[PDB]
Subunit: 315 residues, 4 copies
């Protein structure tokens, strides 16, 4: 009334799961855009039939034309590469995707500016904290209308691994990972809760040890690598994390979700994007929340921002 229009700029693995979940949730009409001929039309057709099983009514259409961005309410950008040519799975690193994806953001930004300047934008392409700011600058959208994927996905892993050890519902574990999405991500032990209760209480009771937590932290940071080596660059959880973000915006839920956003003095940083809890609703990024970090935690945050800055320079 009237349905939102959601344009998926990139119709690969993450794009396909996102289209599926949108139909399941009846969130809006979908366009699967890509540079590859024919493929998005085929995925769209397959996905469109699920409206019957789902009791939904969302159109799903394919596109090879940039001007189909016209009228978009939400734009989700996964366009680019997942690995660098020559690299083995063992040496997979998000940093190596910098030279491959830079110009793709510039091109997409020009089309957004021309076709849908009032859309809400979610950037996924890696390295995400660099790419999101590049797209912000080239699309011209307000700072409250663009974010990057990172923390919702990283914390889903940390939350899940802890919930399995303690035998509680996964969503009952809450946790914060900040700064950047990548190997310098900052995992904040002090801000973990289980059922709203400080995790330290469960450590005091010998229900989970400090050593067990250290191993879970290392597993969290290396999850994408672990999967890439067993199967492929992950796509199912990434997709689910992006849809939780888009849903909060579309339905005005005002959920607190950790995403990459423009910093204007928080943590001592300006003129750069970084991961922090934000509130997402009808007005986009409605609130940027600054965690009251200690000096040891701030020092790790600074390390993460330094890495985004280094790659920003090379783009």
């Amino acid at each position: 009334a009237p349905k939102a229009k959601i344009v998926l700029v990139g119709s690969g693995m993450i794009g396909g799961v996102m289209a599926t979940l949108i139909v399941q949730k009846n969130l809006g009409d979908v366009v699967l855009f890509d540079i590859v001929k024919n493929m998005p039309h085929g995925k769209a057709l397959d996905t469109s039939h699920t409206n019957v099983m789902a009791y939904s009514n969302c159109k799903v259409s394919g596109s090879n034309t940039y001007d189909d961005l016209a009228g978009a309410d939400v734009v989700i950008v996964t366009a680019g590469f997942t690995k660098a040519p020559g690299k083995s799975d063992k040496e997979w690193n998000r940093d190596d995707l910098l030279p491959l994806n830079n110009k793709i953001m510039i091109e997409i930004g020009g089309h957004i500016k021309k076709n849908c300047p009032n859309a809400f934008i979610i950037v996924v392409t890696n390295p995400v904290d660099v790419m999101v700011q590049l797209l912000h600058q080239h699309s011209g959208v307000p700072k409250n209308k663009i974010i990057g994927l990172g923390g919702v996905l990283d914390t889903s892993r940390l939350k899940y691994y802890i919930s399995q050890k303690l035998n509680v519902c996964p969503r009952d574990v809450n946790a914060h990972i900040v700064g950047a999405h990548g190997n310098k991500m900052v995992l904040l032990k002090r801000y973990i809760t289980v059922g709203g209760i400080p995790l330290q209480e469960f450590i005091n009771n010998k229900l989970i040890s400090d050593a067990e937590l250290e191993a879970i932290f290392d597993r969290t940071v290396n999850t994408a690598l672990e999967i890439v080596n067993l199967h492929a660059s992950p796509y199912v959880a990434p997709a689910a994390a992006i849809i939780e973000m888009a849903e909060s915006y579309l339905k005005d839920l005002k959920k607190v979700l950790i995403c990459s956003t423009l910093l204007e003095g928080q943590y001592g940083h300006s003129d750069i994007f970084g991961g922090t809890p934000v509130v997402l609703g009808a007005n986009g990024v409605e609130q940027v929340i600054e965690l009251q970090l200690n000096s040891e935690e701030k020092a790790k945050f600074d390390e993460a921002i330094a890495e985004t800055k280094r790659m920003k320079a090379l783009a």
Copy 2:
């Protein structure tokens, strides 16, 4: 496969909303039992038609016969009175319901013992922390198979009021109220979080003040009174809280939910029921969680248990 059987012992205001929500969620077959002739059959019939609108397949039937408890998987007890004869709305107090509801629990316990000794039991009738233990003793069920409603409902109010002030999604506020359901309920300021973040951070930032919180605490304790005076003994939120508990059991969610349970040394107390976080799954009460309270917080907990003990003596 095969559907669970859920017997609502009491088919009044809370019973009706529970039957409605069960059909909405397709949770199982429902029996609305009551001593009043004809009424439960009428409510059951009305409710049964919603299977069509809901795409569900749950039977809903009325009953005036105790032996329909046979085969029950979950039994939810709301039977009793909501106010004491002679009392004005202004002097409404849960304690005054003690003489009115005592024998009703004994009678129901004998029927459970005979008809469905392996069922999971949820007690609602007031004063709840007294009635639940009375039913435990007369039904003979194991301590992991019976709980009382309190904390899920009380914290929903505290969580909601804070979420409105801060403009975030209601379920993003987490909070703990313990000891007993009633005027001595213990509201734990130290264990409030917003998006997993300590509420004290939002107080430090002047987003919510200490004085505003004190007013919200008083409102929480007096909510039932506030509504009773405007309309009636509350029924919609109570119903929703009970169904969240029953759902966690039926689907093995393992949610951490604050409920009245048998204490065996936690907080220094034994041989009595009191409100504390528990884990609810396929095996019933799978874990009893003891909050590591300070001495000031323990002193308030002791006051709440003393009140349950006082009424236990008068029953």
Copy 3:
């Protein structure tokens, strides 16, 4: 984005269930309006707390002021009486509600015209086929923006009773009841299907007999009477039927649902409202579907319209 505003003009039994279901489905902000002081504020408060259990974010507020209609996207009218003073339960008839509810529609129509002329309106108050046209004329809204409750509720009963006999999922039975909501409702045996298959096939196979169907038809027509005598004027299924209608409009589902709508030559009738399948989406009543009735079926339809005309004259 931004949430719809849904004003419930009337906060009694049906109003309360509607507010509950809206929060469960996260459909929009709710206003419970009524002439009774204090009561809607109490129901609103109780209902608002369920946002926590439901993972929703819908405001629920009470009102005793007509100008709170300002900005409404959907208006649902249940205001009026459910029984006539002096009548016994046994002699309960919707026709007797004509003198009691006539002026209430005129008053509400003037407030809609002034405050929210672009809202979508659903009328429930009895006798519904008369009241809906009265409100259409006094509110000034376009014919595609107002409908009355009838067929979704009446067919839910017929569909349910047949599904129980044949042991299939309730929503798998489809059926049509047309003309008017009341004792002259027209039940169309020829248009019943089970799993998309003509019901006559199941009759040929002795899975259900013609005599069994006649008894089910009589039960359908007399359901409200059956419940009224056991309990009260029904409210849970009515509420669920209204929300299915409002949901189809809000989410642009384009469901085919039988409702009371302005006839402009269909079935040979003009200048009156009557029950027929319609398509509900973003544009309101998007299509009015005319069943290709035979002469025997048309004769019954004519009887139903004659009754609406008779009462229209007495209003």
Copy 4:
């Protein structure tokens, strides 16, 4: 209570979407089994993290060991090949998959018989009407405990294409395709309804023509080919169709769904599996529904069964 165990025998494209949808719906614990080393463990890990976003609690684990079938409640078989080596996309035919998949069913049947003889089985591998009977014979399960995918998927396409032309909710179109899943599938024009109304009424009103329907029928039969040529052997709708079937069994919905089942005289056929409407609930295939086909329709059904028989002979 306790959760169902669902073993996906085959962890390729359809297996991955099924695991995702199971977690979304909280249907049960999942095992992704496959002969490929490492891959199912990687997909399982990725998928497991979505429990957080979904508010679910389903384990998802990978397997390369047949004995992990032990304790299975539902077994879903997609193991095999999707295309024949040497064939171009243009000459893709399900019949060519007969020599490639025959022994795989025999092997899996022996493991089911040994490990989970009381499980409910859904067969997907092509040619499906042949493979399902082969697995029935080698697994030893009762005829009410095994079915094949076909009609739910084929009719989703027909239902969807018609709903787009008429502009109504997709699930409001009902339709029957029977006999076999493949190029001889039987599309029954006489059994199409829209909102429970005979499609012929919409043809009489010039809302859709006979010629338009012929083109939609041809598109339905050739959909898999259309997609295969644009992208790949379809996987998203197939997955959704299988989960609707498994869900009806697990939750005792008793939905009428068209599937491949053992015929014992229906349509004049015995000792073979073929597509027809069935009722799926707690007891498996609870009812086999025989459509009262005319002689022209029966002649097409006979053509479809002849093809299954021909390939059965070559296996």
